Design an enzyme around this catalytic site. Sequence first.
Site, PDB file in Angstrom:
ATOM      1  N   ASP A 182     -19.394 -12.349 -73.195  1.00  0.00           N
ATOM      2  CA  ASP A 182     -18.041 -12.931 -73.236  1.00  0.00           C
ATOM      3  C   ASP A 182     -17.925 -14.060 -74.276  1.00  0.00           C
ATOM      4  OD1 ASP A 182     -17.435 -10.998 -71.248  1.00  0.00           O
ATOM      5  OD2 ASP A 182     -16.831 -12.474 -69.733  1.00  0.00           O
ATOM      6  N   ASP A 196     -17.416 -21.167 -73.063  1.00  0.00           N
ATOM      7  CA  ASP A 196     -17.779 -21.227 -71.655  1.00  0.00           C
ATOM      8  C   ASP A 196     -19.224 -20.766 -71.416  1.00  0.00           C
ATOM      9  OD1 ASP A 196     -17.411 -21.729 -68.877  1.00  0.00           O
ATOM     10  OD2 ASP A 196     -16.809 -19.623 -68.595  1.00  0.00           O
ATOM     11  N   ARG A 206     -24.117 -17.773 -65.453  1.00  0.00           N
ATOM     12  CA  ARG A 206     -23.352 -16.608 -64.998  1.00  0.00           C
ATOM     13  C   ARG A 206     -22.900 -15.696 -66.162  1.00  0.00           C
ATOM     14  NH1 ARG A 206     -21.471 -12.427 -64.268  1.00  0.00           N
ATOM     15  NH2 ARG A 206     -20.420 -11.607 -62.407  1.00  0.00           N
ATOM     16  N   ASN A 207     -22.750 -16.264 -67.363  1.00  0.00           N
ATOM     17  CA  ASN A 207     -22.282 -15.536 -68.547  1.00  0.00           C
ATOM     18  C   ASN A 207     -23.448 -15.060 -69.428  1.00  0.00           C
ATOM     19  OD1 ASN A 207     -19.643 -15.990 -67.631  1.00  0.00           O
ATOM     20  ND2 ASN A 207     -19.324 -17.806 -68.839  1.00  0.00           N
TER      21      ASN A 207
HETATM   22  C1  LIG Z   1     -19.491  -8.211 -70.353  1.00  0.00           C
HETATM   23  O1  LIG Z   1     -19.916  -8.579 -69.039  1.00  0.00           O
HETATM   24  C2  LIG Z   1     -20.934  -7.883 -68.422  1.00  0.00           C
HETATM   25  C3  LIG Z   1     -21.704  -6.936 -69.128  1.00  0.00           C
HETATM   26  C4  LIG Z   1     -22.733  -6.300 -68.438  1.00  0.00           C
HETATM   27  N1  LIG Z   1     -23.698  -5.402 -68.835  1.00  0.00           N
HETATM   28  N2  LIG Z   1     -24.482  -5.030 -67.801  1.00  0.00           N
HETATM   29  C5  LIG Z   1     -24.077  -5.675 -66.736  1.00  0.00           C
HETATM   30  C6  LIG Z   1     -24.730  -5.511 -65.441  1.00  0.00           C
HETATM   31  C7  LIG Z   1     -24.615  -6.276 -64.263  1.00  0.00           C
HETATM   32  N3  LIG Z   1     -25.380  -5.847 -63.284  1.00  0.00           N
HETATM   33  N4  LIG Z   1     -26.052  -4.827 -63.812  1.00  0.00           N
HETATM   34  C8  LIG Z   1     -27.034  -4.129 -63.005  1.00  0.00           C
HETATM   35  C9  LIG Z   1     -25.669  -4.557 -65.095  1.00  0.00           C
HETATM   36  C10 LIG Z   1     -22.974  -6.515 -67.066  1.00  0.00           C
HETATM   37  C11 LIG Z   1     -22.182  -7.432 -66.383  1.00  0.00           C
HETATM   38  C12 LIG Z   1     -21.199  -8.163 -67.060  1.00  0.00           C
HETATM   39  C13 LIG Z   1     -20.520  -9.274 -66.289  1.00  0.00           C
HETATM   40  O2  LIG Z   1     -21.020  -9.652 -65.224  1.00  0.00           O
HETATM   41  N5  LIG Z   1     -19.390  -9.816 -66.764  1.00  0.00           N
HETATM   42  C14 LIG Z   1     -18.761 -10.917 -66.153  1.00  0.00           C
HETATM   43  C15 LIG Z   1     -17.980 -10.744 -64.994  1.00  0.00           C
HETATM   44  C16 LIG Z   1     -17.687  -9.367 -64.430  1.00  0.00           C
HETATM   45  C17 LIG Z   1     -17.433 -11.862 -64.359  1.00  0.00           C
HETATM   46  C18 LIG Z   1     -17.643 -13.141 -64.869  1.00  0.00           C
HETATM   47  C19 LIG Z   1     -18.389 -13.306 -66.032  1.00  0.00           C
HETATM   48  C20 LIG Z   1     -18.968 -12.204 -66.666  1.00  0.00           C
HETATM   49  C21 LIG Z   1     -19.821 -12.431 -67.903  1.00  0.00           C
END
Ligand SMILES: COc1cc2[nH]nc(-c3cnn(C)c3)c2cc1C(=O)Nc1c(C)cccc1C
Length: 282
Positions: free
Chosen positions: A163, A145, A149-150
């Site tokens: 991910d 995927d 966004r990822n």
């Molecule tokens: C492992 O995932 C992450 C690791 C991360 N490291 N640091 C940050 C982060 C985000 N904002 N700041 C300031 C630091 C961060 C966010 C994610 C992330 O947004 N995960 C995610 C989600 C929640 C939904 C849908 C798809 C995904 C990939």
Amino acid sequence: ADPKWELSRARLTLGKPLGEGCFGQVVMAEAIGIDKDRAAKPVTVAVKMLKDDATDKDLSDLVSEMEMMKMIGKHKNIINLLGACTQGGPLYVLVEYAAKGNLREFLRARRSGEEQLTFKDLVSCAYQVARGMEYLASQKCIHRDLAARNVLVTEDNVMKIADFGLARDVHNLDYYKKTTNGRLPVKWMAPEALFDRVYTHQSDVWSFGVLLWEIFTLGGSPYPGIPVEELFKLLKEGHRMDKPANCTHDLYMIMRECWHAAPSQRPTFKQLVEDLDRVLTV
Ligand SMILES: COc1cc2[nH]nc(-c3cnn(C)c3)c2cc1C(=O)Nc1c(C)cccc1C
Ligand SMILES: [Cl-]
Ligand SMILES: [Mg+2]
């Protein structure tokens, strides 16, 4: 508990939610002494954890991800595993914090602000994601995927793919056909991956072409105006997304090569790194 990776819960102070998805909740935290140099230094981390309503299946999937991250090893262009709390209560998987948040939101914030992205910045973004995918492919990791966004952006503008370590069991067709985090993941999927229900490095290269189009539209949503029930028939008939405004011929050539109907006619991640390097050099 694997002692190489285990962190005491007493070293971890959980902070605010950073986001939530199908594969867990992510929260900001401070981890003391996760930097081996200074066993008393606070380092900001992201902690992946289960939702309160989680099942035993969801737990096994989070465990499988953690174990897969250990196997795959470290790279500058992936969100690396830093540690885990596996005994003494809920599973917490510590991964790198990326201060500028996800790439799609980063690009969307730079359509009309002072922090305008140059062409070179955008090509650098694409190059770094290609480098992280080249690494993952060399470790026989198929993402399934890949989308902006990822990908996460650090304080130093390093791109880090997130991910990548998920189990194939969580990438059932229900995930792709339901909205999550302002996207419908099936719009990044290669046609043969939908039809044959098997993913490959070549289907990841297709998704990378869609990611490249996201970068050069500054976070556009793919296939504008096309109903999702009509998309794959249009793709079979040879429909492809148009060139983003102001995008060069070189970059659109790379997108179009990623979307060849024959998986064997797509570039590899190794080739994409070289192609994007050539653009940076010229
Ligand atoms: C492992 O995932 C992450 C690791 C991360 N490291 N640091 C940050 C982060 C985000 N904002 N700041 C300031 C630091 C961060 C966010 C994610 C992330 O947004 N995960 C995610 C989600 C929640 C939904 C849908 C798809 C995904 C990939
Ligand atoms: Cl979408
Ligand atoms: Mg070529």
